[PDB]
Design a protein around this ligand. Sequence first.
Ligand code: NA
Ligand code: NA
Ligand code: NA
Ligand code: NA
Ligand SMILES: [Tl+]
Ligand SMILES: [Tl+]
Ligand SMILES: [Tl+]
Ligand SMILES: [Tl+]
Lengths: 94, 94, 94, 94
Amino acid sequence: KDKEFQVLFVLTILTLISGTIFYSTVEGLRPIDALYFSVVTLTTVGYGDFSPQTDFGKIFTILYIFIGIGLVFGFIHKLAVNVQLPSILSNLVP
Amino acid sequence: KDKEFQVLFVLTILTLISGTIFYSTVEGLRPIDALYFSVVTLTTVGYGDFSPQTDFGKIFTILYIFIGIGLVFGFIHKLAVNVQLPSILSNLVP
Amino acid sequence: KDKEFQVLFVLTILTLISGTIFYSTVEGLRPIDALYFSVVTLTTVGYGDFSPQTDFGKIFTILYIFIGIGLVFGFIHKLAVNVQLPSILSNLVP
Amino acid sequence: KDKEFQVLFVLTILTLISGTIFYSTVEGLRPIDALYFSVVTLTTVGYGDFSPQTDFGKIFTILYIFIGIGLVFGFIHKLAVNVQLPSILSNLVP
Ligand code: NA
Ligand code: NA
Ligand code: NA
Ligand code: NA
Ligand SMILES: [Tl+]
Ligand SMILES: [Tl+]
Ligand SMILES: [Tl+]
Ligand SMILES: [Tl+]
C-alpha cells in the first residue's frame, strides 16, 4: 500500500507534465498557467478563467479529461486513505 | 469484463452524439464545439466558455446531465480499471 | 429497490424546488433560470453563467451545496443502477 | 460512527478556515467571498466568479485542491449516510 501511493504519484505527475507542455505550446499559456489549468481541469473544478481556444486544444482536452480524471482521483483517494487518514488518527491516539 | 467496456463505450458515444446534434442545432454551436461542450458538461468540468442560452437548451441540459453523468463516469471507471489499470502493471512486471 | 428510487426522487425534487424559490426571490432569477442554476450547482457542473451576487445568496449556496450534493448524486446513482442499467441489458437479451 | 462525523466536521472547518485566511490576504477577497470561494473550489463546483490571479494563489490552489477535496467529500458522504440518511427513514416509519 506504500507502493500503491508511489505508482499513482508518478503517473499523476506524468499526466500533469503532458498537459503543461501541450497547453503551453498550443494554447500559448505560461507554463505555470498551463499546469494550474491542467489541475483545475482534471479535478473537474473548471473555473474557466482559462479554456482552450483552438480546435486542436479542444480535441486534446476531450481525450485528456477521459484519460486523466480516473488517475488523478485514484491518487486523491489513496492520498486520502493511505496518507491523510492515518496521520489524523496519529494525532488523536491518547 | 471485456464486454463490459464495449457496451459502456457504445452508450457513451450515443450520448455524446445526441448532445452534439442538439447543441449544434438549437444552440447554434459548430459541431466540434457542441461535442466539446457535451463532454465538458457530462464530466462536470463545466468551464462555461459555452453554455445554453435558450430555454429549450436549459431544459435539455437538465435532463442531459441527470441521464448522462452516470453513464460517462461508469465508462471512465471501467476505462480506469479494465483498461488503464493492467497496462501499468504490465509495464512494471520484472 | 423500487421504493429506493421513489424516495430519492421525491427528495431531489424538494431540494430543487427549495433552490428555485430561493434564487428566484433573493437573486432575482427567472424561475426556469433558478431551477437550471440549482441543477448545475448540485451536480457540480458550475458553468458560472449564473452565480449568487448577494451575501445572503452566497451563504445559502454554501449550505445548499453541502446538504444537497449527497442526495442528488445518490439519486443519479440509483437512477444509474436501478433504472438505466437493466433497460440496457433488456435491449441486449438474445 | 457518531465520532466519525465529529472528526470530519472539525477537519473540514480547519480546511475552510485556512482557505479563507489565505485568499482574503493574498488574493484580497472579502472574508465571506474567500470562504464562499473555498467551498466552491473544494466541492469542485468552480463557478469561476472568483479565481486566483496571483502566481502564489495559483500554486496554493493546486495544493489546496489535492489536499482538501478528499476530506470535504468524505464529510459530505458521512453527512449523507450518518446524519441525513436516518432522519428520512425516521420521517417514514409508520
Ligand atoms: Na511559468
Ligand atoms: Na465542427
Ligand atoms: Na420561468
Ligand atoms: Na466578509
Ligand atoms: Tl465537478
Ligand atoms: Tl465549473
Ligand atoms: Tl465543475
Ligand atoms: Tl466556470
